[PDB]
Amino acid sequence: SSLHPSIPCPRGHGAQKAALVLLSACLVTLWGLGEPPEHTLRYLVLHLASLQLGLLLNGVCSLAEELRHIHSRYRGSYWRTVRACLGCPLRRGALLLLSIYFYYSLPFTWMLALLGLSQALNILLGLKGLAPAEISAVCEKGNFNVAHGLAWSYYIGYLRLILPELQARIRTYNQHYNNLLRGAVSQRLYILLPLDCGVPDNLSMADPNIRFLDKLPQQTGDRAGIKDRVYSNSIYELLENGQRAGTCVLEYATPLQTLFAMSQYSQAGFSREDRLEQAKLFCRTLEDILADAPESQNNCRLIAYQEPADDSSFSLSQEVLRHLRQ
């Protein structure tokens, strides 16, 4: 939200207000007409009970398929494999008893046969699907994305490991290896987030002004059974109108390159328009992660930019220098 305006805000409570308005409208419409109050209640109760009897058939149909993986997903317990499909077997049983009592006392098997036939037609023809705007809410409320996992892996593997040790290297470099004639490299490690999934291997391209300057001292650790895992960084110069203007550290994000490469392979099943919404979500998730980390923005900065379609004299140098202003 605060990085770039095109980042969507989290979904809120907007359907509920529309539901309230619709409820009030239908209630006043019922009041304006002539019909007994008891008949409306009875019909509403029957409709509600039918909508609940229409889910047990779907649950049994789903169980008829889920029972084949009892030894692979539900250990060996029938209680778990029935709880995974038919909600909770305690509320559901009472609801079933009440529904059958209200449906049997108020041609009885005819309705059962018709409900079964309708449910079978719905499940076979596939009429009961999910809208694209509802999947995007169910898979975002429950964290069912790829960007969430990528952001958490990035944080855990890189930021939780180099950020505390960042100052101890730059401070030593600025005195031992950096000449007093050259300006000292700035703090606040900078990460660039191109909202296009285009991550060049080298930073020299796409901007003829930034040039590779020097190295940084490396650090060593033990991870996942492999020792001497070396982390190294680099420093780039900023040439403004042909003359040096400042120095900093520029970083891309490898997960963006991974998202870009996913859209090309056929086995991935990743569409071209998915790697854009995931790219948008990744930045928000990473910013949220960094907001409350103990190693806060005191050592890092984020830069998000969208490449103009008309090439309105856009240059990375202007953005990075404007960031270096703060």
Ligand X SMILES: Nc1nc(=O)c2ncn([C@@H]3O[C@@H]4COP(=O)(O)O[C@H]5[C@@H](O)[C@H](n6cnc7c(N)ncnc76)O[C@@H]5COP(=O)(O)O[C@@H]3[C@@H]4O)c2[nH]1
Binding annotation for 2',3'-cGAMP: 153, 158, 229, 254
Give 102-118 as a DSSP string: HHHH---HHHHHHHHHH
Half-sphere exposure for 77 (CA within 13 Å, toward CB): 7
Q: Which residues is 235 bridged to in the sheet?
A: 214
Give 145-167 as a DSSP string: -SHHHHHHHHIIIIIHHHSTTHH
Q: Which of 154, 190, 270, 282 binds ligand X (CB under 6 A)?
A: 154
206 interacts with, out of ligand X, a copy of itself, none, CB within 5 to 8 A per kind: none
Q: What's the rounded Cα separation, in Å, for the pair 99 and 310?
A: 63
Per-residue binding letters, 193-232, with a copy of itself (x by CB under 8 A): ------xxxxx--------x--x------xxxxxxxxx-x
Of 144-152, 181-189, 238-246, 308-316, the segment contacting a copy of itself by CB under 8 A is 144-152
Q: Is 152 in the site for ligand X (CB under 6 A)?
A: no
Which of 225/308 has CB closer to a copy of itself?
Answer: 225
313 interacts with, out of a copy of itself, ligand X, none, CB within 5 to 8 A per kind: none
Q: What's the rounded Cα separation, in Å, for the pair 285 and 149?
A: 10
Which of 154/236 has CB closer to ligand X?
Answer: 154
Q: Is 202 in the site for ligand X (CB under 6 A)?
A: no
Smallest distance from the beta carbon of 147 to ligand X, in angstroms?
Answer: 12
- Is residue 108 within 8 Å of residue 50, measured between CB atoms? no
Q: What's the rounded Cα separation, in Å, for the pair 212 and 188?
A: 19
| Coil, strand or helix at 132 | helix
Of 109-117, 174-182, 303-311, 314-322, the segment contacting a copy of itself by CB under 8 A is 109-117
Smallest distance from the beta carbon of 304 to ligand X, in angstroms?
Answer: 17
| Coil, strand or helix at 212 | strand
158 interacts with, out of a copy of itself, ligand X, none, CB within 5 to 8 A per kind: ligand X
Smallest distance from the beta carbon of 267 to a copy of itself, in angstroms?
Answer: 7
Q: Which of 125, 127, 226, 309 binds ligand X (CB under 6 A)?
A: 226
Smallest distance from the beta carbon of 227 to ligand X, in angstroms?
Answer: 10
- 195's CB contacts (< 8 A; 6+ apart) are 4, 6, 276, 279, 280, 283, 304, 305, 306
Which of 49/286 has CB closer to ligand X?
Answer: 286
Residues making up the annotated binding site for 2',3'-cUAMP are 158, 229, 254
- Is residue 238 within 8 Å of residue 317, measured between CB atoms? yes
* Continuous H helices in the chain: 15-32, 37-66, 70-73, 78-83, 91-105, 109-125, 132-141, 147-154, 160-162, 166-176, 254-262, 274-291, 316-325
The CA-based dihedral angle spanning residues 202, 207, 210, 215, taken in that order and rounded to the nearest 10 degrees? -10
Q: Is 190 in the site for a copy of itself (CB under 8 A)?
A: no
62 interacts with, out of a copy of itself, ligand X, none, CB within 5 to 8 A per kind: a copy of itself
Q: Is 309 in the site for a copy of itself (CB under 8 A)?
A: no
Smallest distance from the beta carbon of 242 to a copy of itself, in angstroms?
Answer: 22
Whole-Å CA distances, 230 to 67, 85, 160? 48, 48, 15
Contacting positions for ligand X (CB under 6 A): 153-154, 157-158, 224, 226, 229, 231, 251, 254-255, 258
